[PDB]
Amino acid sequence: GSESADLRALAKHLYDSYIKSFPLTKAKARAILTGKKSPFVIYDMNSLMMGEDKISKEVAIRIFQGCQFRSVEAVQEITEYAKSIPGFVNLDLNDQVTLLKYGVHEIIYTMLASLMNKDGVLISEGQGFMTREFLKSLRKPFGDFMEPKFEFAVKFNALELDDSDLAIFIAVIILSGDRPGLLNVKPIEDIQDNLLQALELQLKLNHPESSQLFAKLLQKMTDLRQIVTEHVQLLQVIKKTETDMSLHPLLQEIYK
Amino acid sequence: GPLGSESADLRALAKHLYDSYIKSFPLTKAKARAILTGKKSPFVIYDMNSLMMGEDKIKFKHKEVAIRIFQGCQFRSVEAVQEITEYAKSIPGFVNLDLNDQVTLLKYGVHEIIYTMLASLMNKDGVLISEGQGFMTREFLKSLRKPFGDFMEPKFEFAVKFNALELDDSDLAIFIAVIILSGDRPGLLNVKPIEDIQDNLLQALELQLKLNHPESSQLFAKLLQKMTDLRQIVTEHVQLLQVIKKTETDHPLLQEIYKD
């Protein structure tokens, strides 16, 4: 459905569903970040130790393990959101699985930028703030999991998107007909075409002075694919440089 | 100011880019497509024997056959860099950038542009070579021993999907300019002027596609998305170049012309 009212209705539906699925929105994160109960700041080992008390015995490994756990909850929220995208649950079930498998990390890093500024990232449901410099200080390769993600977040956040923009952007990401192993490509591309039309209209109305925002956002798609390629590389380094690390079933499947 | 003038300047920019592209790139997509229909006729290289006969037919100006094909490809890519460099100068704003950023944009843009434009010369079954005088089959390229056999295949896979967008030379002129003006290349000194120029090229491309391909819903978005997949082609290309560098050491001035 392609008329203006249809696209506006889709935009509103997705925002509604996004607020329903994701407890910590960009609105709530930015209110936390700007101070409007201040989050506990983790900037070094001593503050990490206190933070673990105030908010796997090795440090870089412990941080990564809490990251895994949070990515599991994020995968759960994103799946609930995907089911709300019109047409998604009507697709071939194996294609639903593939779209989530290949889409969740791109969405995780998009939404992680909502929680980040140049100095650090909100953690634990907004109760903590881990500094960029602390994460930079971590031993190879763990030190390397977060830094270009901060590079990405700063430029992404300069686009000034709000939650209502992000709701549709994330849907566009999920409905990507180029995922490996998709059986029925066209039904997915049709849905994405309609989501793209809706995103275009949304940015034009919500950011009328932002020239080529639509194109600029689609370009971040590139940044996201690369980020996820880096993440997978870094998982492979971990396989080589660590001992037994338990992995959540969900993450095992997605990484396969 | 006056109504319609924004559209007019964006059309004038598109036209300027097209005429420049015509100047810089002798074998256009229109010309190559005509050749690919097969009615004059290019020499067809479909195996090792016809390759040997095609070196008699087409005199190439660049031993183990996979390595020879690879060397010819290096020669042709260097030629392509000079054509692209010349095209880049006619993109408004480009020559007024920091000289060092000009060099950076070109270093990190050319491969993306080479493989984009190579799709103009490709169908699902092979690729035009030597200024349209030869056609080498995808099957023959696929047959070359590892790692050479998989040099071209991902490029064919990309090209078939890219070609299904049915862009013409007027579209490609603007898309290539957008690629060159990428503000995210490593070591750029002044990002903002590059993005400002790319903004106006993106506006021109969007308008060009809306007018030239009205029945192609969201083609602008779909093209930007490909833009995304060229990057992967290139990264994997660069990965392969590193394999050859280290495992295919089998002279100095040559090495210097091809520093890459």
Q: Which residues contact B58 (CB under 8 A, 6 or more apart)?
A: B43, B129, B130, B133, B134
Q: Which of B225, B232, B233, B239 to mutate to test the interface with A (most CBs of A within 10 A)?
A: B225
A193 and B217 within 8 Å at the Cβ level: the answer is yes
For residue A181, count CB atoms less than 10 angstroms from its CB and return exposed for 0-12, middle for 13-18, buried for 19 or more: exposed
Phi-psi region of A117 (alpha: psi -120 to 50; beta: other; left: phi over 0): beta
CA A216 distance to own-chain centroid: 18
Amino acid at A163: D
Provide the shortest C-alpha distance from residue B214 to chain A (in Å). Answer: 14
Amino acid at B111: H
A215 and B224 within 8 Å at the Cβ level: the answer is yes
Q: Which two tokens stand for residue A161?
A: 């998107």
Q: Which two tokens stand for residue A3?
A: 């008329």
Phi/psi for A42 (5° steps) reads -105, 110
What residues does each domain of chain B span? 1-260
Q: How many CB atoms lie within 10 A of CB B228?
A: 18
DSSP-assigned states of every residue in chain A: --SHHHHHHHHHHHHHHHHHH-SS-HHHHHHHHHT--PPEEE-SHHHHHHHHHH---SHHHHHHHHHHHHHHHHHHHHHHHHHTSTTGGGS-HHHHHHHHHHHHHHHHHHHHHTTEETTEEEETTTTEEEEHHHHHTSPTTGGGSSHHHHHHHHHHHTT---HHHHHHHHHHHHS-TTSTT-S-HHHHHHHHHHHHHHHHHHHHHH-TT-TTHHHHHHHHHHHHHHHHHHHHHHHHHHHHH-S-----HHHHHHH-
> B42: closest CA among B125, B136, B120?
B136
Q: Quick one: three-class SS letters along B238-255?
A: HHHHHHHHHHCCCCHHHH
Chain breaks in chain B (C to N over 2.5 A) after: 39, 62, 250
> Domain B1-260's class?
mainly alpha
Cβ contact A252:A134 at 8 Å:
no
B202 and A212 within 8 Å at the Cβ level: the answer is yes
Report whether the peptide linkage leading into residue B154 is cis, meaning its omega lies within 30 degrees of zero. Answer: no
Cβ contact A246:A56 at 8 Å:
no
| Mutual angle of helices A213-241 and A93-113, in 10-degree steps | 100
Q: Which two tokens stand for residue A180?
A: 């490996």
> B89: closest CA among B20, B29, B27?
B20
Beta strand pairing status for A116-117 and A120-123? antiparallel
What spatial distance separates the first Cα and last Cα of chain B, rounded to whole Å?
A: 46
Sign of the alpha-carbon dihedral angle for B249, B252, B258, B260:
positive
- Whose tokens are 């006969």? That residue is B53
Cβ contact B212:B168 at 8 Å:
yes
Amino acid at A187: P
Residues of B in contact with A218 (CB under 8 A): 221, 224-225
Q: Which of B224, B231, B235 to mutate to test the interface with A (most CBs of A within 10 A)?
A: B224
> B234: closest CA among B192, B181, B185, B188?
B185
CA A143 distance to own-chain centroid: 20
Q: Quick one: three-class SS letters along chain B?
A: CCCCHHHHHHHHHHHHHHHHHHHHCCCCHHHHHHHHCCCCCCEEECCHHHHHHHHHHCCCCCCCHHHHHHHHHHHHHHHHHHHHHHHHHCCCCHHHCCHHHHHHHHHHHHHHHHHHHHHHHEECCEEEECCCCEEEEHHHHHHCCCCCHHHHHHHHHHHHHHHCCCCCHHHHHHHHHHHHCCCCCCCCCCHHHHHHHHHHHHHHHHHHHHHHCCCCCCHHHHHHHHHHHHHHHHHHHHHHHHHHHHHCCCCHHHHHHCCC
Q: How was this structure determined?
A: X-ray
Q: Radius of gyration of chain A from Cα atoms?
A: 19
Nearest to B227 among A197, A222, A226 (CB): A222
Q: Which residues contact A124 (CB under 8 A, 6 or more apart)?
A: A55
Q: Which two tokens stand for residue B245?
A: 């560098």
The Cα B16–Cα A148 span in angstroms is: 38
For residue A127, count CB atoms less than 10 angstroms from its CB and return exposed for 0-12, middle for 13-18, buried for 19 or more: middle
Q: How many CB atoms lie within 10 A of CB B48?
A: 13
For residue A120, count CB atoms less than 10 angstroms from its CB and return exposed for 0-12, middle for 13-18, buried for 19 or more: buried
Cβ contact B28:B22 at 8 Å:
yes
> A128: closest CA among A51, A71, A53?
A51
Residues of B in contact with A219 (CB under 8 A): 224, 227
A214 marked as binding residue: no
Beta strand pairing status for A116-117 and A128-131? unpaired
- Whose tokens are 């449901």? That residue is A125
CATH topology of domain A1-256: Retinoid X Receptor (1.10.565)
The Cα B201–Cα B182 span in angstroms is: 11
For residue B182, count CB atoms less than 10 angstroms from its CB and return exposed for 0-12, middle for 13-18, buried for 19 or more: buried
The Cα B233–Cα B123 span in angstroms is: 17
CA B30 distance to own-chain centroid: 15
Angle at A87 between CA A84 and CA A92, to 5 degrees: 110
CA distances from A222 to A229, A231, B54, B163 (A): 11, 14, 40, 20
A213 to chain B: closest CA residue: B199
A225 and B217 within 8 Å at the Cβ level: the answer is no
Q: Which residues of B210-220 are buried (b: 16+ CB within 10 A; e: fewer)?
A: eeebeeebbbb
B228 and A214 within 8 Å at the Cβ level: the answer is no
Q: Which of A221, A223, A229, A233 to mutate to test the interface with B (most CBs of B within 10 A)?
A: A221
CA distances from B57 to A171, B53, B101 (A): 54, 6, 42
B227 and A225 within 8 Å at the Cβ level: the answer is no
Phi/psi for A78 (5° steps) reads -70, -40
Nearest to A215 among B202, B217, B228 (CB): B202
> B221: closest CA among A189, A53, A28, A75?
A189
Q: Which two tokens stand for residue B117?
A: 């434009």
The Cα B241–Cα B238 span in angstroms is: 5
A255 marked as binding residue: yes
Cβ contact B174:B12 at 8 Å:
no
Phi/psi for B134 (5° steps) reads -125, 160
The Cα B258–Cα B132 span in angstroms is: 24
Give residues 205 to 224 of B whose Cβ lies within 8 Å of A.
Answer: 206, 217-218, 220-221, 224
> B18: closest CA among B201, B229, B154, B249?
B201
B221 and A218 within 8 Å at the Cβ level: the answer is yes
Provide the shortest C-alpha distance from residue A111 to chain B (in Å). Answer: 20
The Cα A212–Cα A4 span in angstroms is: 20
CA A228 distance to own-chain centroid: 11
B225 to chain A: closest CA residue: A218
The Cα A196–Cα A215 span in angstroms is: 11
| Mutual angle of helices B99-118 and B65-89, in 10-degree steps | 130
Nearest to A225 among B202, B221, B228 (CB): B228
Nearest to A221 among B206, B220, B228 (CB): B228
Sign of the alpha-carbon dihedral angle for A198, A172, A129, A156:
negative
Report whether the peptide linkage leading into residue B147 is cis, meaning its omega lies within 30 degrees of zero. Answer: yes
Cβ contact B136:B45 at 8 Å:
yes
Q: How many CB atoms lie within 10 A of CB B81?
A: 18
Q: Quick one: three-class SS letters along A55-83?
A: CCCCHHHHHHHHHHHHHHHHHHHHHHHHH
Data resolution in angstroms: 2.0
